[PDB]
């Protein structure tokens, strides 16, 4: 299928005392495998997936020394932005980072991502192409030059389509059972009070869409189970009750199931 | 497999 690798971050100002916190977890096609939390008691990289385990010891600290330096940077960032903001410094502000890259069923590089944000709205980003960035406002805007006179932006290009992907198949190769199989969702449907929804069961990966149709509809964000599987249901309003048909399809399934009953 | 370097906003 189509696979990928990502690393999510979140750093947050805390003026009072405070706690400039920093979580770090990464995802292989929406599978947890990494961990770096400051308020914790390890100050390292902890395993979370039963396949991260194998790499050597200096891999792990080959990785703690970095999320370490990721963290200390957003100390500056968090305390740099306000320079735009002229804000209070008795306020808890938030910065999230986001860089990554994907690869088709080719196993060869495809697209590449790199975006920052603050307040939960877009700050700066890196387009499809790796020449050039995305400016949101004038604050996010200033940053650009020193990513545009120093060229630091320029390199990520060496790493994303180069270093990143080989890491991904370093991961995928020995990730075979718990990273790259197709979980077929099982289905049921129910009726009460009338209201009809047809549920989908225990499916990987994340993205599915189910829907109904012609012979005012409630549904829900995907829910994680904890088994590395997922959830969704589709509240649709209908007495006579043969009604509509649920359109269920995702890669796991041979082709879209139809069952009105 | 992460960024071996880091830049400051």
């Amino acid at each position: 299928g189509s696979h990928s690798m990502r690393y999510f971050f979140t750093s947050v100002s805390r003026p009072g005392r405070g706690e400039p916190r920093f979580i770090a977890v990464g995802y292989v096609d929406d599978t947890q495998f990494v961990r770096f939390d400051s308020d914790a008691a390890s100050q390292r990289m902890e395993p979370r997936a039963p396949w991260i385990e194998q790499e050597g010891p200096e891999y792990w600290d080959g990785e703690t020394r970095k999320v370490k330096a990721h963290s200390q940077t957003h100390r500056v960032d968090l305390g740099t932005l306000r320079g735009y903001y002229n804000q209070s410094e008795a306020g808890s502000h938030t910065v999230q980072r986001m860089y990554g890259c994907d690869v088709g069923s080719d196993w060869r590089f495809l697209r590449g991502y790199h975006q920052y944000a603050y307040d939960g709205k877009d700050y700066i980003a890196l387009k499809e192409d790796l020449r050039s960035w995305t400016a949101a406002d004038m604050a996010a805007q200033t940053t650009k030059h020193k990513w545009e006179a120093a060229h630091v932006a320029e390199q990520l290009r060496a790493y994303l389509e180069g270093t990143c992907v080989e890491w991904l198949r370093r991961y995928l190769e020995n990730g075979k059972e718990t990273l790259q199989r197709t979980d077929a969702p099982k289905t049921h449907m129910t009726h009460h009070a009338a209201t009809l929804r047809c549920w989908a069961l225990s499916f990987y990966p994340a993205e599915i869409t189910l829907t109904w149709q012609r012979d005012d509809t409630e549904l829900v964000e995907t829910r994680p189970a904890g088994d590395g599987t997922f959830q969704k249901w589709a509240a649709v309003v209908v007495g006579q009750e043969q009604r509509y048909t649920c359109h269920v399809q995702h890669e796991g399934l041979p082709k879209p199931l139809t069952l009105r009953w | 497999g992460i960024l071996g370097f880091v830049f400051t906003l």
Partner: T-cell receptor, first 111, second 111 residues
């Protein structure tokens, strides 16, 4: 390692001169520095994309489309340009913050 | 300008040294290099911004630290004849960038 050639070169007043880098890893940034004895390295030309960069020069710096070696010529030699010449390529595929410099060719100009 | 303390001195096997280099203004990524006739420039230890300890290629016989920006020291627990060279302390605000090398501090270690 980042290689460089020739060992050391001895041209005359008037002649042309040609040096080159060759790396092992893939670089997208190629920088030529020069230091005259006793001082720090000083940036001469920087290259970012494949294709040429004429500036400053006199000079002409090339980006090998291999993304794995570059070139530096100097036309109409002048004794004012004696020095140790370098190629800096901030790796890079290394996934480190390293700034790799070469062997460095020593130019000397007999007028 | 980056100031290099001290510009030239001598010592003996076993007695530690501390070569501090100043900084302005509010640059972040600085490293220390080594050079001698022969192999030319190489990189020893470097640190992007503050408190980021990163080794690099020629380490042994060295160590380093930095908890604030303005100063950056390379210390040596056991000067041995291998480290008799010519050290440089270059400077720029972010990785990568053009570097601002120093005067030229040279330490000579004797038996």
């Amino acid at each position: 390692q980042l290689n460089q050639s020739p060992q050391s070169m001895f041209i005359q007043e008037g002649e042309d001169v040609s040096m080159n880098c060759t790396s092992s890893s893939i670089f997208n940034t190629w920088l030529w520095y020069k230091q005259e004895p006793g001082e720090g390295p000083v940036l001469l030309i920087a290259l970012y994309k494949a294709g040429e960069l004429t500036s400053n020069g006199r000079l002409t710096a090339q980006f090998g489309i291999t993304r794995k070696d570059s070139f530096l010529n100097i036309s109409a030699s002048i004794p004012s340009d004696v020095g140790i010449y370098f190629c800096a390529g901030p790796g890079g595929s290394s996934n480190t913050g390293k700034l790799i410099f070469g062997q460095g060719t020593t130019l000397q100009v007999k007028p | 300008q980056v100031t290099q303390n001290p510009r030239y001195l001598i010592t003996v096997t076993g007695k530690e040294l501390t070569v501090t280099c100043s900084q302005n203004m509010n640059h972040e990524y600085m490293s220390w290099y080594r050079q001698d006739p022969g192999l030319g420039l190489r990189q020893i230890y470097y640190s992007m911004n503050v408190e980021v300890t990163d080794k690099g290629d020629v380490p042994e016989g060295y160590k380093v630290s930095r908890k604030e920006k303005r100063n950056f020291p390379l210390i040596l627990e056991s000067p041995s004849p291998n480290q008799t060279s010519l050290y440089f302390c270059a400077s720029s605000l972010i990785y990568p960038g053009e570097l601002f090398f120093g005067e030229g501090s040279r330490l000579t270690v004797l038996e």
